Design a protein around this motif. Sequence first.
Motif, PDB file in Angstrom:
ATOM      1  N   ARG A 103       0.805  -1.207   0.000  1.00  0.00           N
ATOM      2  CA  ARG A 103       0.000   0.000   0.000  1.00  0.00           C
ATOM      3  C   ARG A 103       0.843   1.264   0.000  1.00  0.00           C
ATOM      4  NH1 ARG A 103      -4.916  -1.993   2.758  1.00  0.00           N
ATOM      5  NH2 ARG A 103      -4.461  -3.949   3.859  1.00  0.00           N
ATOM      6  N   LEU A 105       4.736   3.182  -1.333  1.00  0.00           N
ATOM      7  CA  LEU A 105       6.093   3.213  -1.853  1.00  0.00           C
ATOM      8  C   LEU A 105       7.101   3.155  -0.720  1.00  0.00           C
ATOM      9  CD1 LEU A 105       6.640   3.455  -4.971  1.00  0.00           C
ATOM     10  CD2 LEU A 105       4.367   4.231  -4.288  1.00  0.00           C
ATOM     11  N   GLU A 106       6.755   3.743   0.425  1.00  0.00           N
ATOM     12  CA  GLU A 106       7.656   3.737   1.568  1.00  0.00           C
ATOM     13  C   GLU A 106       7.964   2.316   2.007  1.00  0.00           C
ATOM     14  OE1 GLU A 106       6.895   8.038   1.599  1.00  0.00           O
ATOM     15  OE2 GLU A 106       8.556   6.615   1.669  1.00  0.00           O
ATOM     16  N   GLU A 184     -10.425  19.996  14.030  1.00  0.00           N
ATOM     17  CA  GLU A 184     -10.789  18.814  13.256  1.00  0.00           C
ATOM     18  C   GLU A 184     -11.638  17.854  14.068  1.00  0.00           C
ATOM     19  OE1 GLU A 184      -7.962  19.507  14.190  1.00  0.00           O
ATOM     20  OE2 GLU A 184      -6.901  17.816  15.117  1.00  0.00           O
ATOM     21  N   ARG A 185     -11.496  17.839  15.390  1.00  0.00           N
ATOM     22  CA  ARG A 185     -12.414  17.039  16.192  1.00  0.00           C
ATOM     23  C   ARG A 185     -13.834  17.557  16.051  1.00  0.00           C
ATOM     24  NH1 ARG A 185     -10.470  13.290  19.385  1.00  0.00           N
ATOM     25  NH2 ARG A 185      -8.273  13.298  20.025  1.00  0.00           N
ATOM     26  N   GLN A 188     -14.982  16.354  12.601  1.00  0.00           N
ATOM     27  CA  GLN A 188     -15.335  14.943  12.641  1.00  0.00           C
ATOM     28  C   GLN A 188     -16.686  14.733  13.301  1.00  0.00           C
ATOM     29  OE1 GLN A 188     -13.537  11.831  11.406  1.00  0.00           O
ATOM     30  NE2 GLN A 188     -15.762  11.706  11.616  1.00  0.00           N
TER      31      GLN A 188
ATOM     32  N   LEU C   7      -2.328  14.324  10.672  1.00  0.00           N
ATOM     33  CA  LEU C   7      -2.725  14.802  11.987  1.00  0.00           C
ATOM     34  C   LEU C   7      -3.435  13.664  12.705  1.00  0.00           C
ATOM     35  CD1 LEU C   7      -2.944  17.335  13.836  1.00  0.00           C
ATOM     36  CD2 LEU C   7      -5.011  17.875  12.604  1.00  0.00           C
ATOM     37  N   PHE C   8      -3.095  13.463  13.978  1.00  0.00           N
ATOM     38  CA  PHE C   8      -3.403  12.199  14.640  1.00  0.00           C
ATOM     39  C   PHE C   8      -4.896  11.967  14.825  1.00  0.00           C
ATOM     40  CE2 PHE C   8      -3.964   9.511  18.386  1.00  0.00           C
ATOM     41  CZ  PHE C   8      -3.210   8.425  18.024  1.00  0.00           C
ATOM     42  N   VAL C   9      -5.717  13.009  14.775  1.00  0.00           N
ATOM     43  CA  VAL C   9      -7.149  12.869  15.001  1.00  0.00           C
ATOM     44  C   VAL C   9      -7.889  13.754  14.020  1.00  0.00           C
ATOM     45  CG1 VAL C   9      -7.091  12.148  17.387  1.00  0.00           C
ATOM     46  CG2 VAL C   9      -6.930  14.570  16.781  1.00  0.00           C
ATOM     47  N   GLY C  10      -9.091  13.344  13.653  1.00  0.00           N
ATOM     48  CA  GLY C  10      -9.963  14.155  12.832  1.00  0.00           C
ATOM     49  C   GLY C  10     -10.332  13.459  11.541  1.00  0.00           C
ATOM     50  N   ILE C  11     -10.904  14.243  10.626  1.00  0.00           N
ATOM     51  CA  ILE C  11     -11.267  13.730   9.313  1.00  0.00           C
ATOM     52  C   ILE C  11     -10.028  13.172   8.640  1.00  0.00           C
ATOM     53  CG2 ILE C  11     -12.206  14.308   7.057  1.00  0.00           C
ATOM     54  CD1 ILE C  11     -14.201  14.360   9.322  1.00  0.00           C
ATOM     55  N   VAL C  17       1.789   8.456   4.211  1.00  0.00           N
ATOM     56  CA  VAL C  17       2.628   7.638   3.350  1.00  0.00           C
ATOM     57  C   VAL C  17       2.117   7.815   1.930  1.00  0.00           C
ATOM     58  CG1 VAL C  17       3.005   6.006   5.224  1.00  0.00           C
ATOM     59  CG2 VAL C  17       1.284   5.515   3.506  1.00  0.00           C
ATOM     60  N   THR C  18       3.034   7.879   0.973  1.00  0.00           N
ATOM     61  CA  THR C  18       2.647   8.126  -0.411  1.00  0.00           C
ATOM     62  C   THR C  18       1.899   6.907  -0.920  1.00  0.00           C
ATOM     63  OG1 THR C  18       4.815   7.356  -1.127  1.00  0.00           O
ATOM     64  CG2 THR C  18       4.515   9.719  -0.813  1.00  0.00           C
ATOM     65  N   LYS C  19       0.576   7.014  -0.987  1.00  0.00           N
ATOM     66  CA  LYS C  19      -0.255   5.856  -1.259  1.00  0.00           C
ATOM     67  C   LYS C  19      -0.026   5.348  -2.674  1.00  0.00           C
ATOM     68  CE  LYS C  19      -2.906   4.385   1.207  1.00  0.00           C
ATOM     69  NZ  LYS C  19      -2.710   3.354   2.259  1.00  0.00           N
ATOM     70  N   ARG C  20      -0.463   4.117  -2.900  1.00  0.00           N
ATOM     71  CA  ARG C  20      -0.125   3.370  -4.096  1.00  0.00           C
ATOM     72  C   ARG C  20      -1.373   2.717  -4.667  1.00  0.00           C
ATOM     73  NH1 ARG C  20       1.407  -1.873  -5.462  1.00  0.00           N
ATOM     74  NH2 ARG C  20       3.075  -1.977  -7.036  1.00  0.00           N
ATOM     75  N   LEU C  22      -2.991  -0.450  -6.377  1.00  0.00           N
ATOM     76  CA  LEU C  22      -2.701  -1.880  -6.395  1.00  0.00           C
ATOM     77  C   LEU C  22      -2.880  -2.446  -7.795  1.00  0.00           C
ATOM     78  CD1 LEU C  22      -3.556  -1.174  -3.371  1.00  0.00           C
ATOM     79  CD2 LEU C  22      -4.020  -3.609  -3.178  1.00  0.00           C
ATOM     80  N   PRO C  23      -1.987  -3.320  -8.251  1.00  0.00           N
ATOM     81  CA  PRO C  23      -2.187  -3.944  -9.550  1.00  0.00           C
ATOM     82  C   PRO C  23      -3.393  -4.859  -9.516  1.00  0.00           C
ATOM     83  CG  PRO C  23      -0.103  -4.624  -8.489  1.00  0.00           C
ATOM     84  CD  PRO C  23      -1.005  -4.056  -7.448  1.00  0.00           C
TER      85      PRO C  23
END
Lengths: 205, 51, 100
Positions: A103, A105-106, A184-185, A188, C7-11, C17-20, C22-23
Amino acid sequence: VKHNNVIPNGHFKKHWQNYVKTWFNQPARKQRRRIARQKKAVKIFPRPTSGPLRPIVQCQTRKYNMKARAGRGFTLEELKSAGIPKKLAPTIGISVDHRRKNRSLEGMQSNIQRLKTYKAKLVIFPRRARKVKAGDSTPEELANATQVQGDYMPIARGEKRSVEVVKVTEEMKEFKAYGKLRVERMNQRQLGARQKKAAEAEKEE
Amino acid sequence: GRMFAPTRIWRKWHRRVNVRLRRVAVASALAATAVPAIVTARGHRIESVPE
Amino acid sequence: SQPKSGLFVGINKGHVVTKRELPPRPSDRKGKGTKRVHFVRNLIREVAGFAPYEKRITELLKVGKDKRALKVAKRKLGTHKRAKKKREEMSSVLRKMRSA
RNA sequence: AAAGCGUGGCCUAUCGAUCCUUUAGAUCUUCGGAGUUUGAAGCUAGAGGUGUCAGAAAAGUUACCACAGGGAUUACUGGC
RNA sequence: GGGCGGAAGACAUUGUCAGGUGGGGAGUUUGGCUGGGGCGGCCAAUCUGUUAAAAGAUAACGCAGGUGUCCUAAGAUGAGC
RNA sequence: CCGACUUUGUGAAAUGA
RNA sequence: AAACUUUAAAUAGGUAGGAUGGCGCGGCUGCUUCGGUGAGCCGUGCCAUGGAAUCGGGUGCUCCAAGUGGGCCAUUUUUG
RNA sequence: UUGAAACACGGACCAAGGAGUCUGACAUGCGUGCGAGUCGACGGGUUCUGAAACCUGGGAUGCGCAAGGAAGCUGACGAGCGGGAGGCCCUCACGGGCCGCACCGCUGGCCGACCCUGAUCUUCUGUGAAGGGUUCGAGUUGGAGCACGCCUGUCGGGACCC
RNA sequence: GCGCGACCCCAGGUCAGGCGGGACUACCGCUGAGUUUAAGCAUAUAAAUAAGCGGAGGAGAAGAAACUUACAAGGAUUCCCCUAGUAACGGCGAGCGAACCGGGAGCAGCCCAGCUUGAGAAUCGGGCGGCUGUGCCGUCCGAAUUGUAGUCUGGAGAGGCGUCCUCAGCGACGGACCGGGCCCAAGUCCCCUGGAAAGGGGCGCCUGGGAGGGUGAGAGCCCCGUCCGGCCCGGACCCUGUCGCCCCACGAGGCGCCGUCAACGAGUCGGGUUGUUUGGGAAUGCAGCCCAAAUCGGGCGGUAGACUCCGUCCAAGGCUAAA
Ligand SMILES: C[C@@H]1C[C@@H]([C@H](O)CC2CC(=O)NC(=O)C2)C(=O)[C@@H](C)C1
Ligand SMILES: [Mg+2]
Ligand SMILES: [Mg+2]
Ligand SMILES: [Mg+2]
Ligand SMILES: [Mg+2]
Ligand SMILES: [Mg+2]
Ligand SMILES: [Mg+2]
Ligand SMILES: [Mg+2]
Ligand SMILES: [Mg+2]
Ligand SMILES: [Mg+2]
Ligand SMILES: [Mg+2]
Ligand SMILES: [Mg+2]
Ligand SMILES: [Mg+2]
Ligand SMILES: [Mg+2]
Ligand SMILES: [Mg+2]
Ligand SMILES: [Mg+2]
Ligand SMILES: [Mg+2]
Ligand SMILES: [Mg+2]
Ligand SMILES: [Mg+2]
Ligand SMILES: [Mg+2]
Ligand SMILES: [Mg+2]
Ligand SMILES: [Mg+2]
Ligand SMILES: [Mg+2]
Ligand SMILES: [Mg+2]
Ligand SMILES: [Mg+2]
Ligand SMILES: [Mg+2]
Ligand SMILES: [Mg+2]
Ligand SMILES: [Mg+2]
Ligand SMILES: [Mg+2]
Ligand SMILES: [Mg+2]
Ligand SMILES: [Mg+2]
Ligand SMILES: [Mg+2]
Ligand SMILES: [Mg+2]
Ligand SMILES: [Mg+2]
Ligand SMILES: [Mg+2]
Ligand SMILES: [Mg+2]
């Protein structure tokens, strides 16, 4: 029951004396496992004693999401991009886990560096004596081959504690991080109530 | 007949001591090896050892 | 799709991470009907016939009372998810028999 | 009019736990992938009741009887 | 004449649920106080007076009695009598 | 004890839709 | 005259007999007063021969816990 | 047992066996090690009499260092007074003053639940300058805890024995 | 007045063969209590246990996701620690009570059914015969087209193109592992007590051997033994170590591209109701009865419900050491 004491939770109302398990054979299992490890090492000489290669992966579960550990196998994407065929990877000491998904590249390049490192410091005996085919290795460096013992490619469980020293800028002081962290809370919480009014805004206007 | 409260294999045979307490005790024993009066009290014939 | 907010909380909270993408795998076609299986099922369908509750579905649909059609289809099959698509399939059979 | 008086009856009695159900209240909290949306689960405060009233859900008989015990306890004698 | 001979016949019946009956049978209970226990009663919640010995506390199946309610007024206040 | 579903198929009439 | 009382003992009951007191000065109060008027507190400075008799180290503070929860006799008061 | 020499029960005598033990959890007290840490207990490497011993991980495993709420969630913005051991200063000393740990009592402050309150700022629903409360907390304004051992006690197990 | 072929079923002391019972530690399946605890007792508890009835092995069972999770996600099974005496379940009383995550031990993944030789059953068994003998080969019968072999298993695959890259067997000699046998240091010196010297004194010796045992009393040196190893015999070997001859293809695989197909398990899932069981709570598994599928689909995401989106996996066939 009597004077102030915790409320007991003795789970000894069954026939637990028929199921007590004693550990007097603990030294015995230690020694038997040690013996089994010697007699596997001598058989798989000169293969690495830890076994095939294992990927750096992240754990699950918010408590341990940041802590990397050895997984079960490289994905098909990773084997393909490192140039090693599916059915051949388990042959030469590389695990394969067809169930994992890449999922990030990292993650992918992180494990690709491991595949390249393993192929860099891998040696493969020929299937026969004189016939050296493609993918083999030359006798002159085959002759010094040893059985590495222990973990031959260690995995750091967390990124190192590093604290550099930097400037404290004015716009960095102005940043109300708690106000940010409440906004952001709030969003949400209100996510449904917002999108609903948007939905009937479209539906009517 | 039986014995009262028969002996059972799941007594506490092995007791645990803190690793640091074992190390402290080995330190005190090593220190006590160095004192001639302690060895001689403890029961070793040392009237002719050089040092 | 696009990665987390960082950000650890919220929407869309989490760590970036640079998402990928999937094949394609096998089993993403899992259930995609094929030419020959459609041929087989359609052929055997009229040879066997229609089960009695399915005939009752045909009758209620050709009357047009779709609510009770769904209701009896649900009471036979068991769940709304399959009752709905059974009603769709039988409505398809009624359009393909009132087409001619 | 005001000082004041009024948190039930001039005072001394006239009443009720846990769990469950049910109601009142916040434009309250959760249903743990994210929402709309019924339902459900909560929090605070009442009622549904335990009269054996600090609150088990509960009919007899034994001379066919049994076990543990009691002279804390009856019938015979003794005692005041 | 490819029906062994009759009868009943998609009803009996088989299986699964559904309700009633079911000491034939199972499991279990059948309070406490108590001048023995049982019957009686409540002295088991609870109020007043006394016993209670001039602070408080104080018992008996002591004594004379009461309570499980009644009230939009028989509650609150004011005024007059 | 009786009710429903099931083995439980065939065609026919009379009353309800 | 136990379920009557005007009066009303003895015995026993409660409280006080200082250093955890008092006075002066200047400060706070969102309480209180018509109001420095109070009530209380705060800082500071002064005084306070130990404030009846007798006796004496203290549960003074805390913890953990045993057994007990069948009582009986006597003088006086006292219920049947 | 209120009461036994009792006309209360057991005991003819001798010898041997004979009844609060083991385990789990917890707790107080005490000892030891370390001490905002502390445990190496499951594994691994060693181990030339050895089921021992020694080493190893832990960067977060257990407990402890943060609590209040049912929950979403929020999460200690820095303490004074009275009495005090003890030390110190002055005096010939009697006496006086200063600093006053522990502990006891009193009043507060801060966090959270519930209530109350609302300048500004802001992603318009969030924040929260000021001000709070006869409320509630197993809180904070003291980091003292972890591990092992022992006794005692409660409870589960046959659980002092029949 | 029949001769035929198929089906289905007979009887055979037919030829060749497999079954039954025993042991209980551990293991698999069913069945299945109460004494006890709750200071009574009836749900609960005892306990998904004891007893009953069966089935195997050296281990058994499970096992390669119709998984968990909500993460930066991981990734078969089994076991230990932690999770945790926790979430949950319970006349919410007594009590009962797992799982995910993480750390370790060990880690191996596989093969079927289906569309696919149709110039052509390429497959298998049996009788007889041979040889090199756990099999191979020839011939003759039979099985089988209601499908044996081959290709395929979703991670795919089938096709088409491609420089290319990858495949074979037989000998010897050991090592390794297992069993067995034989062998292996030194006082029995002098005196005394003693029935006996293995005791006491004195003079000595071995020790990589002072574990133990015997012998007429506390024996290192009398004896068997113990330490170091040495020697030889036999096994299974199917593990690898090097030598030697045999030289690996037009078949299969891998890799790169294409875009066309892309076939995947039914009274099964799934649903209702009942019963049991669970920690599983609008129902955790299982089971009976009824209903009963789907192929732009199906099962999950621990609160039933409908809609939208998202995360995830592919059941109803099979094998599989290790801890
Ligand atoms: C009719 C209802 C009966 C009773 C309650 O249902 C009995 C419960 C309470 C209890 O003690 N535990 C139980 O399991 C039974 C109650 O609460 C009353 C107010 C009214
Ligand atoms: Mg008022
Ligand atoms: Mg009145
Ligand atoms: Mg009043
Ligand atoms: Mg009530
Ligand atoms: Mg959910
Ligand atoms: Mg009572
Ligand atoms: Mg009876
Ligand atoms: Mg009779
Ligand atoms: Mg009966
Ligand atoms: Mg009685
Ligand atoms: Mg009587
Ligand atoms: Mg008096
Ligand atoms: Mg009085
Ligand atoms: Mg007086
Ligand atoms: Mg007596
Ligand atoms: Mg007598
Ligand atoms: Mg007796
Ligand atoms: Mg006797
Ligand atoms: Mg730690
Ligand atoms: Mg102080
Ligand atoms: Mg005990
Ligand atoms: Mg028991
Ligand atoms: Mg009981
Ligand atoms: Mg009992
Ligand atoms: Mg009973
Ligand atoms: Mg059994
Ligand atoms: Mg197996
Ligand atoms: Mg814990
Ligand atoms: Mg259970
Ligand atoms: Mg010898
Ligand atoms: Mg001698
Ligand atoms: Mg000897
Ligand atoms: Mg059962
Ligand atoms: Mg169920
Ligand atoms: Mg299997």
